[PDB]
Amino acid sequence: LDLETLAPYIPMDGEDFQL
Amino acid sequence: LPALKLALEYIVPCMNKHGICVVDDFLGKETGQQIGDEVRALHDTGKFTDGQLVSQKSDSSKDIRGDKITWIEGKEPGCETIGLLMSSMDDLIRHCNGKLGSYKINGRTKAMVACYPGNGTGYVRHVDNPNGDGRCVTCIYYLNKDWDAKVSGGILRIFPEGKAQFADIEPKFDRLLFFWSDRRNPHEVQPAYATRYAITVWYFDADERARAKVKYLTG
Numbered sequence: 001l002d003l004e005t006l007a008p009y010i011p012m013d014g015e016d017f018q019l
Numbered sequence: 020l021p022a023l024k025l026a027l028e029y030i031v032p033c034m035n036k037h038g039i040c041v042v043d044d045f046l047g048k049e050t051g052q053q054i055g056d057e058v059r060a061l062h063d064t065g066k067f068t069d070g071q072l073v074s075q076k077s078d079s080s081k082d083i084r085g086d087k088i089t090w091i092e093g094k095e096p097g098c099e100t101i102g103l104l105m106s107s108m109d110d111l112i113r114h115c116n117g118k119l120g121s122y123k124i125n126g127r128t129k130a131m132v133a134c135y136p137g138n139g140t141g142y143v144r145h146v147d148n149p150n151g152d153g154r155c156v157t158c159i160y161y162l163n164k165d166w167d168a169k170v171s172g173g174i175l176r177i178f179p180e181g182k183a184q185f186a187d188i189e190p191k192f193d194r195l196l197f198f199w200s201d202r203r204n205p206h207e208v209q210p211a212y213a214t215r216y217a218i219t220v221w222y223f224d225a226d227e228r229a230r231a232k233v234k235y236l237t238g
C-alpha cells in the first residue's frame with residue numbers, strides 16, 4: 001500500500017515559509 | 020515560557036529520546052481562548068474545505084480523513100493570535116537549531132487549521148511524511164476548552180517505533196505537541212463525537228525538502 005495515499009497534503013511549490 | 024530553556028532542556032531531549040514531546044499550558048488561557056475564537060470564526064464563515072491527501076487514487080478523501088481545514092499564513096485580518104501561535108512555535112524551533120536529530124530546519128508549511136465536526140469523523144492510521152517530502156517535525160496546538168475525551172473521543176494515538184506502549188494524546192486545550200513526521204510515528208485520530216479543533220505546522224529539513232522540490236519541479 002502506498003502510504004502517500006494516506007498522508008496529509010501540503011503544497012509542494014510556492015508556499016513554504018522561511019524561518 | 021522563555022523559549023531557550025524550554026527548547027534546550029525539554030523539547031530537544033524529549034524529541035531525541037522519544038520522538039514525541041508534549042508541552043501543556045503553552046500560551047495560557049487568555050491567548051488560548053482568543054485562538055479558539057479566531058478558529059471558530061473561520062469555521063462559521065465557511066473557510067474550511069475537505070482535508071486532502073498527498074496522492075489521490077480512486078478513493079474518497081473522506082474515507083481516509085474526515086476533517087475540514089484551511090491554511091493560514093498568520094498575517095490575515097482576524098488571525099492575529101493564530102499568527103502569535105505560529106511565531107511562538109517558530110521561536111522554539113529556532114532555539115533548537117541543529118539539536119533535533121541531524122536535521123537542519125530552515126522553513127515550514129503554512130498553518131493547517133483543522134476541524135473534525137463530530138459525527139464520528141477521524142483520520143485513519145497514517146504517517147505524515149512517508150516518502151521524503153521534506154517534513155521532519157509535526158507541531159500541533161490543541162484548543163478544545165471543555166473536551167472530555169472519555170465521551171467525545173478524538174484522541175490522537177501515536178505508535179512510536181520501538182516502544183512497548185503507544186502514546187495517547189488527548190486534544191487538550193492549550194496543549195502543544197511535537198513529533199517526528201516520518202515513519203517512526205504512525206498515528207491515527209480516533210473518532211470525534213464533538214467539534215474538535217487543532218492547528219498544525221510542519222517543519223522542513225532543508226536538504227530533504229530541496230530534494231523533494233527537485234522531484235516536483237522535474238515531474
Ligand SMILES: O=C(O)CCC(=O)C(=O)O
Pocket residue numbers: 008133142147159174175190206207208217219
Ligand atoms: O489532530 C490531530 O491530533 C492529528 C492530525 C493528523 O494526524 C493530520 O492531520 O495528519
Ligand SMILES: [Cl-]
Pocket residue numbers: 034035036037038
Ligand atoms: Cl527518537
Ligand SMILES: [Cl-]
Pocket residue numbers: 115116117118122123124125
Ligand atoms: Cl536546524
Ligand SMILES: [Fe+3]
Pocket residue numbers: 008145146147206
Ligand atoms: Fe497526521
Ligand SMILES: [Mg+2]
Pocket residue numbers: 066095
Ligand atoms: Mg481566510
Ligand SMILES: [Mg+2]
Pocket residue numbers: 088089090091
Ligand atoms: Mg486554504
Ligand SMILES: [Mg+2]
Pocket residue numbers: 168169170171172173212
Ligand atoms: Mg468516545
